[PDB]
Design a protein around this ligand. Structure first.
Ligand code: URP
Ligand code: ZN
Ligand code: ZN
Ligand code: ZN
Lengths: 412, 412
């Protein structure tokens, strides 16, 4: 508790990095493996080397900035996130975890603290998945989720592959991607949701990450005149789609407290006010921390959709387009985060990460958990994404002590 | 006198020729009001009318008046006409049949060298469908004094373009004042857009009434947030609200069977991202009934259900009724003239209430007016498979021809 971070220095680094790719709306547009992403990586690498770090890059472009330990070859305690952003990205998504880890190294240097295990800060390539799909591809390769050839062959809209662009910006590293043991892993991140702010809690002790299932549904009925078409004989595709929306809501509430169910996207055809809609495309978003429950939500959706379609007379195309496994983070790492919050007197609570992060894939090959701070209005993936300096400072203090606790564990 | 008849083949071919302008792959027409395709159809009709000896004027709402001179130069005209614009999923007969049928009336009179006491006019009414700019029948509404010219010209499409702007763009911003000119009589020929005449094996529908309508625009405002990290108890989903109003609207219609009509045809979800709870949804409501009191009961149920749905979720509501006209009883003498024409030709006929709104519904307020119906295949309209046989098309034009001659040969 005598060891604390320099909040102003960390805050200034975030304000500085937000200028690289700054958008007119006040956000950051630093797409993965662009010249702007190269600029942000190079600046972070420069700051890390100035703090005495040795830097390596792996074959997926992941950056490892290492602070030596007493046992130089012991498994590292690592932190990290992503430095790339969405086209409408905020100033704290991803970059906070990277710069928060940089501040951890600097604070340890300032207090002359030597750790048993070495400490690393990591930048993961293309977490956002916007310029290249899928998201989190590089931490996926590291964790064995994807093959290396798959990761390097992902193309953007212009046909450029990740491997080509890594070579172009000088981040085609020589270190093999994955297979290197890690003692512990932590990812510091803004919540991207409203829980911590609404409850006036400073730290979210992330215990789990949600599993996901994404769907695309099209109902096909018959477009017809809104007036003289008799009501019983109508095949209204929006009437069906509206009832699935309500069903999706019911399915989410039936699996509280952590179940999530949303219909976010809908397209009505022909979308003329005096035409019965003949076709409606829409999406379904399911999330739950338990995989077995999540599959029950899938079964209930498929069963309810077929029922709604049969009662009206609609044709149905239903496809699951995405699946993401639920993650239970490592208890020892979770306890280190909880104790760090406690030592500082930061009001905290256990929280499930509603979105996916590189920590979710990393958790499959290394003991991992996450640290959450609140964000203003729960806003993320928007240029107006915001957090207070006190929130920013508090999460870095928890990350500092969570890492120091596990990095000072004697080498068994 | 039945020896005066229309040229069924010539009228049919004019319909097939117009169907090329905006032809869709399924065999319908996509010729939205005040588009370049709508302009093309207008120019072709004007050219055919001029070839038939008509003088053509265009008024301030873009209405086209094709005039056949009479013996009495100052007499009030007997007018017929419909609309040349279509739905996005429009058929080949909705609206255009009434225009081309009137053109065939002028040609048939020329073929038999018939001179009438009153002048005869065939009219194209602007943006009758009310799809691209809302509401329906706005141009005939301004003509009848129901709406002001400023209201008619300020109606906007989804891109903010007004009727007045688009009239100027396609060269149909006329100089003649809209309305204020006396009419001796008015008749509109149209397909039923319903199944009654086909089901009863009747050739002519003697339109005695048209049901009243009420159109609404509703915007629900909730809270846009990420579908993942936002827990279900903290949501204000605007699409959940709109979905329940769609079902409520369907319920209100079934509660007033057999003639109640209720539809949600248009919806716009914001931001419409699959992993974002919708924060705002705009949508429309279409209510119809032949009894004004029942139509008002449907209105009360809608406003009550909307407020209840909105309060249960936490949504803000903007609800505007943007269109309302009471049920119309057409002029008895004009109805009887239609009935008598069908009798003279031996066309099996029946009295019928119009399920859709037509420009004749507004014209009936300033001039003696009624309509002639022919059946359509499977009763379907506002679908590209909308169909009518050449026999139906020919028979309705013969009724229009003799109904119009009934009033046009009346001496001043
Ligand atoms: N042409 C036509 O279908 N009528 C438009 C007005 C209405 O929807 O009743
Ligand atoms: Zn992130
Ligand atoms: Zn029509
Ligand atoms: Zn229509």
């Amino acid at each position: 508790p005598s060891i604390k971070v320099d909040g102003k220095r960390l805050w200034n680094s975030l304000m500085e990095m937000a200028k690289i790719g700054a958008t007119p709306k006040g956000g950051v547009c630093r797409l993965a493996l662009t010249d702007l992403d190269k600029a942000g990586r190079d600046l972070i690498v420069r700051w890390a080397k100035e703090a005495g770090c040795t830097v390596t890059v792996d074959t997926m472009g992941n950056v490892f900035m290492r602070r030596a330990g007493r046992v130089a070859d012991a498994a590292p305690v690592v932190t990290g996130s992503h430095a790339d952003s969405q086209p409408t990205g905020g100033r704290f998504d991803g970059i906070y975890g990277v710069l928060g880890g940089l501040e951890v190294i600097r604070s340890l240097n300032d207090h002359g603290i030597e750790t048993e295990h070495p400490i690393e800060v990591v930048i993961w390539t293309n977490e956002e998945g916007s310029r290249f799909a899928p998201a989190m591809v590089a931490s996926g390769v590291f964790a064995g989720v994807f093959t290396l050839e798959y990761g390097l062959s992902r193309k953007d809209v212009d046909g450029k592959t990740i491997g080509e662009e890594l070579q172009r910006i000088g981040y085609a590293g020589d270190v093999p991607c994955g297979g290197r043991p890690l003692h512990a892993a932590f990812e510091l991140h803004i919540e991207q949701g409203p829980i911590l702010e609404a409850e006036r809690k400073t730290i979210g002790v992330v215990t789990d990450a949600q599993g996901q299932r994404w769907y695309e549904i099209t109902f096909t009925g018959q477009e017809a005149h809104a007036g003289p078409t008799p009501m019983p004989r109508r095949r209204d595709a929006l009437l069906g789609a509206s009832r699935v929306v309500d069903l999706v809501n019911r399915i989410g509430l039936d699996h509280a407290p952590f179940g999530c169910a949303t219909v976010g996207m809908m397209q009505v055809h022909p979308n003329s006010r005096n035409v019965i809609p003949g076709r409606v495309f829409f999406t379904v978003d399911f999330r739950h921390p338990d995989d077995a429950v999540l599959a029950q939500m899938d079964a209930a959706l498929r069963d309810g959709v077929a029922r709604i379609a049969a009662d009206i007379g609609l044709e149905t195309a239903l496809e699951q387009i995405f699946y993401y496994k639920p993650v239970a983070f490592d208890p020892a790492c979770v306890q280190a985060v909880r104790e760090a919050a406690e030592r500082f007197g930061y009001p905290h609570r256990d929280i499930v990460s509603g979105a996916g992060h590189d920590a979710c894939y990393l958790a499959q090959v290394a003991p991992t958990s996450m640290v959450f701070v609140p964000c203003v209005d729960g806003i993320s993936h928007n240029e107006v994404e915001d957090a207070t300096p006190e929130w920013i400072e508090a999460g870095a203090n928890v990350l500092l002590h969570a890492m120091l606790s596990r990095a000072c564990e004697p080498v068994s």
